[PDB]
Write a protein that binds this ligand. Structure first.
Ligand SMILES: CCOc1ccccc1-c1ccc(-c2nc3ccncc3c(O)c2C#N)cc1
Ligand SMILES: [Mg+2]
Ligand SMILES: [Zn+2]
Length: 320
C-alpha cells in the first residue's frame, strides 16, 4: 500500500474549517463536492466531533487519512470524493443517533466508511468473477469488498499509521471486526437479504439492538444507506453524481464489448435512453426500501428517505 508524503499529513494538522461549514456538515443533504482541498480536513473534523478531540493521536490520524487518500484510484466514481461522501453520511447518522452506538463503533464505522472502496479499479464483482481476475480467485464472494478490507489493514500496519494502537488487545480485535463486517456489508448483493430480515424483525417487534446479530444487520443497512447517499442530495448534485457512476459503468461495458460480451443495460452506453427508467427501478427496488427500513429502525434518519423520495419524483418528471 502507498505511503503519504510528510508534507501531506503536516498540512492536514493545521487545517482549520470555516465556521459557516460547522452547521452545514451536520445536515444530511450536505454535499462536500465544492470543498475538495477541505475533504481530508472534513474527515478530521467529523471524527473529533463524533469520537472526541483526543480519541486518536493527531499525527497517526493525519498520516492514516492522507495514506487512505493516496490508495484511492483516479476512477470516475469509486474514488476519494466517494469515500468522504460516504463517511460524511455516516457522521450525520451517528450524530443523530449518538448514544445508540459505542465509542468503538463510531470510530470503526467512520474509518470503515472512509476505507470501504480502497483501491477500487473501476470494475464490478460480476466483471472480475466473469473474466477470472486474480482478485476473484483470492476472494470467492464480495470480491472487491474483501480486498477493500485487506487494503484497510495494509494501511493500519504502516509506520506511524496504526490509529488503534492505544486500544486494548480485545478492543483492537473488536474494532477490526466492526470495520470488516461494515466493509463487507457494502456489497449490494448482501443488502437485499439484509433488508428483508430487518423488515421482518421490525414488523414483528423482534428487532433488538442489544442482540449482536441484529446489531451487525442494522450497521449493515447503515453502510448501504451511506454508500447510496448520492440519491439523498439535492437534485442537481444527484444528477452530477449519476454522470460519474455512468462514466465508470460504461467504461466497464466497453471492456466487455472488446471481448465480444454484451454488458447489462446499465453498463451499456448505447442504452442511455433507458437511464431514467433504470434510475426509477433502482429507486423503487433498492433506494426507497433501504431508507424506509432505516427510518423505521433509526427515526432521526428520516431526512434521507424524504430526499430520496424527492429524487424519485425528479426521475419520474424526466421519464415524462
Ligand atoms: C447500481 C448502483 O449504482 C447506483 C448507485 C447510486 C445511485 C444510483 C445508481 C444507479 C446506477 C445505474 C442505474 C441503472 N442505469 C441504467 C441505465 C440504462 N438501462 C438500465 C439501467 C438500469 O437498470 C440501472 C439500474 N439499476 C441505476 C442506479
Ligand atoms: Mg464498494
Ligand atoms: Zn462505495
Amino acid at each position: 500500500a502507498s505511503i503519504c508524503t510528510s508534507e501531506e499529513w503536516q498540512g492536514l494538522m493545521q487545517f482549520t474549517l470555516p465556521v459557516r461549514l460547522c452547521k452545514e456538515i451536520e445536515l444530511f443533504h450536505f454535499d462536500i463536492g465544492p470543498f475538495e482541498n477541505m475533504w481530508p480536513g472534513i474527515f478530521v473534523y467529523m471524527v473529533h466531533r463524533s469520537c472526541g478531540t483526543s480519541c486518536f493521536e493527531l499525527e497517526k490520524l493525519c498520516r492514516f487519512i492522507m495514506s487512505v487518500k493516496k490508495n484511492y484510484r483516479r476512477v470516475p466514481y469509486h474514488n476519494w470524493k466517494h469515500a468522504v461522501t460516504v463517511a460524511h453520511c455516516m457522521y450525520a447518522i451517528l450524530q443523530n443517533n449518538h448514544t445508540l452506538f459505542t465509542d468503538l463503533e463510531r470510530k470503526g464505522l467512520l474509518i470503515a466508511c472512509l476505507c470501504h472502496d480502497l483501491d477500487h479499479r473501476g470494475f464490478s464483482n460480476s466483471y472480475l468473477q466473469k473474466f477470472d481476475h486474480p482478485l476473484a480467485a483470492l476472494y470467492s464472494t464480495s470480491t472487491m469488498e474483501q480486498h477493500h478490507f485487506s487494503q484497510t489493514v495494509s494501511i493500519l500496519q504502516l509506520e506511524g499509521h496504526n490509529i488503534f494502537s492505544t486500544l486494548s488487545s480485545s478492543e483492537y480485535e473488536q474494532v477490526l471486526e466492526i470495520i470488516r463486517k461494515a466493509i463487507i456489508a457494502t456489497d449490494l448483493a448482501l443488502y437485499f437479504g439484509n433488508r428483508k430480515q430487518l423488515e421482518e424483525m421490525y414488523q414483528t417487534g423482534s428487532l433488538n439492538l442489544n442482540n449482536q446479530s441484529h446489531r451487525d444487520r442494522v450497521i449493515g443497512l447503515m453502510m448501504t444507506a451511506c454508500d447510496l447517499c448520492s440519491v439523498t442530495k439535492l437534485w442537481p448534485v444527484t444528477k452530477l453524481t449519476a454522470n460519474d457512476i455512468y462514466a465508470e459503468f460504461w467504461a466497464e461495458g466497453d471492456e466487455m464489448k472488446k471481448l465480444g460480451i454484451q454488458p447489462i443495460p446499465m453498463m451499456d452506453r448505447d442504452k442511455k435512453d433507458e437511464v431514467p427508467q433504470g434510475q426509477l427501478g433502482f429507486y423503487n427496488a433498492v433506494a426507497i426500501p433501504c431508507y424506509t427500513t432505516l427510518t423505521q429502525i433509526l427515526p432521526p434518519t428520516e431526512p434521507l428517505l424524504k430526499a430520496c423520495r424527492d429524487n424519485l419524483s425528479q426521475w419520474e418528471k424526466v421519464i415524462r
